[PDB]
Amino acid sequence: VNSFSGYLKLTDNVYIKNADIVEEAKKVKPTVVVNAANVYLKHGGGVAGALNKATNNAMQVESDDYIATNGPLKVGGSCVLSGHNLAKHCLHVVGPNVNKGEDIQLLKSAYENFNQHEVLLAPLLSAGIFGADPIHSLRVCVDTVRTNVYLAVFDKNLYDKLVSSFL
């Protein structure tokens, strides 16, 4: 039993809700919140910009130190950093950005990072400003993640379409 509330159950382990991931994180304080990161951990917009703003830029300060020490992430890769006031940990995961021309096959590799954590609050990777089809992203999530994932979808119109079309 965990503290997530109001989710529709898609599969044994995948759940979905129309919610702002920022407000959901602030309420649940999950062990792991997933960020829709880029390789430079520059949290300027989309989910990343919103999560970082909610930390009063502390996520960005921590991220800049991480990059100065370790260099950029790989597309499809991840790193674990602090969750600040939102969660215990933030798993920064880099899905391919279609608006940069990156290989959508890397989306499965991106979701594989979730399997290192028993329970996660997460957005749909490569959706939104990353330019991929969110229906496809949900399919890859369901077919790749085996741990318990609670997906927050900000756009209500998109949420209804994802549910109505789910196989």
Ligand X SMILES: O=C1CC[C@@H](c2ccccc2)N1Nc1ncnc2[nH]c(Br)cc12
Site residues for ligand X per CB under 6 A: 20-22, 36, 46-47, 50, 123-124, 127-130, 134, 152-155, 158
Residue nearest to ligand X (CB): 128
* Residue-by-residue DSSP string for 31-92: SEEEEE--TT----SHHHHHHHHHTTTHHHHHHHHHHHHH-PPPTT-EEEEE-TTT-SEEEE
CB closer to ligand X, 65 vs 165 = 165
Query: Can you tell me the distance from the alpha carbon of 21 to that of 26, in angstroms, rounded to the nearest whole number?
Result: 8
CB of 33 to ligand X, least distance (A): 10
CA atoms within 13 A on the CB side of 80: 10
CB closer to ligand X, 57 vs 65 = 57
CB of 159 to ligand X, least distance (A): 8
CB of 21 to ligand X, least distance (A): 3
